[PDB]
């Protein structure tokens, strides 16, 4: 059947983007500015060891089990006059969570065992640089159910509810625990788990609550 491809890039200069564009024109590949459920490939700017910075496209590419590949894939494919294999250029890590964690590969191979399967997540209060609905999409892609209001968690013993907050975007986030029994964690719990494609322990991300 058909090859299926639709590409975005992340962290590229306009000159580097124009090489992607030339590569996409040569091989007849769709290239868009925004990531969507159609996207198959995220082309990250990396160093020579395939380490990138963490952008929203990085997180969403990993979350969707997409090909998250170095820009070197493009440059080397131009030089070789053919589309090279993605496995040879896959992003290995990032400047926050580790240079060789292999989160992208882990996610691509783990879509039948998603990191937040069995969790219900409320993305609560203000976020910066990342609209609430994009954080909600990210966690859904990773197998969580999303709730919009605390009240609508529910229900018995095995849950498990989790409230995610970005304190520095905000007082109020210290009094959530007096209302519901769910652990309250920083947004870094989500981002770190997604980049590593490994559900992190809550402990270091818990936001101390007023008794």
């Amino acid at each position: 059947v058909n090859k299926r491809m639709s590409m975005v890039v992340s962290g590229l200069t306009p000159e580097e983007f124009m090489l992607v564009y030339k590569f996409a024109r040569k091989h007849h590949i769709t290239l868009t500015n925004l990531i969507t459920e159609e996207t198959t490939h995220v082309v990250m700017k990396t160093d020579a060891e395939f380490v990138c910075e963490r952008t929203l496209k990085y997180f969403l590419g990993i979350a969707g089990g997409k090909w998250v590949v170095s820009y070197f894939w493009v440059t080397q494919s131009i030089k070789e006059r053919k589309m090279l294999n993605e496995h040879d250029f896959e992003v290995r890590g990032d400047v926050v969570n580790g240079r060789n964690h292999q989160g992208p590969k882990r996610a691509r191979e783990s879509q039948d065992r998603k990191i937040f399967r069995g969790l219900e997540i409320c993305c609560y209060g203000p976020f910066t640089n990342m609209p609430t609905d994009q954080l909600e999409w990210m966690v859904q892609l990773c197998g969580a159910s999303v709730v919009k209001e605390l009240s609508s968690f529910t229900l018995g013993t095995g849950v498990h509810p989790i409230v995610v907050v970005q304190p520095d975007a905000w007082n109020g986030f210290h009094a959530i625990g007096q209302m519901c029994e769910a652990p309250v964690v920083t947004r870094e719990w989500v981002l770190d788990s997604v980049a590593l494609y490994q559900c992190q322990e809550l402990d270091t991300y818990l936001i101390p609550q007023i008794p």
Partner: peptide, 7 residues
């Protein structure tokens, strides 16, 4: 414009 980074 410029994509935000998450340090």
């Amino acid at each position: 414009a410029c994509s935000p980074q998450f340090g």
